[PDB]
Homo-oligomer: A and B are copies of this chain.
Amino acid sequence: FSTPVDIDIVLADADKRAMVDVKLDKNRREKVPLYMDGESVKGCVTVRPKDGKRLEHTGIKVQFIGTIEMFFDRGNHYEFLSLVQELAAPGELQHPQTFDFNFKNVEKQYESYNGINVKLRYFVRVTVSRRMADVIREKDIWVYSYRIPPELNSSIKMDVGIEDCLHIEFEYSKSKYHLKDVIVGRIYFLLVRLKIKHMELSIIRRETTGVAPNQYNESETLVRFEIMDGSPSRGETIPIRLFLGGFDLTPTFRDVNKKFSTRYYLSLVLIDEDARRYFKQSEIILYRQPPE
């Protein structure tokens, strides 16, 4: 036999509309249509019958859903957006039928995310209601969030050290970088009484999930970029130029629906000849640039 009916969802702007990729578990890349906050979502639900039989139903509806999924558990799923359009009353289907739908000016407050303990995703869900088992079809969507240049973008500049052993001033040109921006910086050496083998700059991603003492932090190290080979002396200046376009980062996400945060840190690491390791971590905000 198979299914008596197959549901497909075709958008009205399906040819012209842009699509975007998502990295999922074990290097998989999905591609879905792309939307932003305030756009209308409209198209058609196409019902393809497959048998010459009849389908008794107690209603057909289409829903636009945005939801946050935590820890791979269905009981922790929270819909932050739900919109319904009823497409048909209780009845029968004997032949193919199509139904229009339009969700007017749809709010989409968060960017889509696929992480470790957290997913945030948007989809269209069509439901054909039946007496004991519904026929359900999901259709996934990417939503981006956009942001213009910030009013204030201060340089990150600091003196740090291990007392009487290593004193350094480091500088990074901004606090806020767009996803295809460049870390321009320098390291300046004030006091050096240790034997430095190499120095690297690391971009660390932290996913923070939960509320209050229920906090799980997942940490991933997305670059290790060597910026110095060998032992400097005092008065030595080391230039940093690190291109972010080589690492495909997600934006900074802060307290999203009061459930999770995704944060980015520059971690400067110096290693001595005996393999001792000296570090300083600094938060950087990553943002998605609106194209002009």
* A interface residue numbers (CB < 8 A to B): 37-38, 58-60, 78-92, 103-107, 109, 210-212, 214, 255, 257-259
Contacts of A78 in B (CB 8 A): 84, 86
Of the candidates B85, B88, B104, the one whose C-beta lies within 8 Å of that of A38 is B104
Closest residue on chain B to residue A91 by CB atoms:
B212
Tell me the bound Cα distance from A178 to B166 in angstroms: 84
Least CB distance from A177 to B in Å reads 26
Closest residue on chain B to residue A92 by CB atoms:
B212
Q: Find out whether the CB atom of B211 lies under 8 angstroms from the CB atom of A90.
A: yes
Contacts of A107 in B (CB 8 A): 83, 103-106
Least CB distance from A45 to B in Å reads 13
Q: Find out whether the CB atom of A211 lies under 8 angstroms from the CB atom of B91.
A: yes
Instruction: Give 6 closest A-B pairs by Cβ, nearest first.
Output: A90-B211, A82-B82, A89-B258, A86-B257, A80-B84, A89-B211
Contacts of A81 in B (CB 8 A): 82-84
Least CB distance from A48 to B in Å reads 21
Q: Find out whether the CB atom of B90 lies under 8 angstroms from the CB atom of A212.
A: yes
Asked, given contacts A91-B211, A103-B107, whether A84 binds B86 with beta carbons under 8 Å apart, the answer is no
Q: Find out whether the CB atom of B211 lies under 8 angstroms from the CB atom of A59.
A: yes
Contacts of A87 in B (CB 8 A): 258
Of the candidates B79, B83, B255, the one whose C-beta lies within 8 Å of that of A89 is B255
Tell me the bound Cα distance from A60 to B212 in angstroms: 13
Of the candidates B84, B89, B105, B258, the one whose C-beta lies within 8 Å of that of A105 is B105
Tell me the bound Cα distance from A92 to B212 in angstroms: 9
Tell me the bound Cα distance from A106 to B92 in angstroms: 33
Least CB distance from A63 to B in Å reads 9
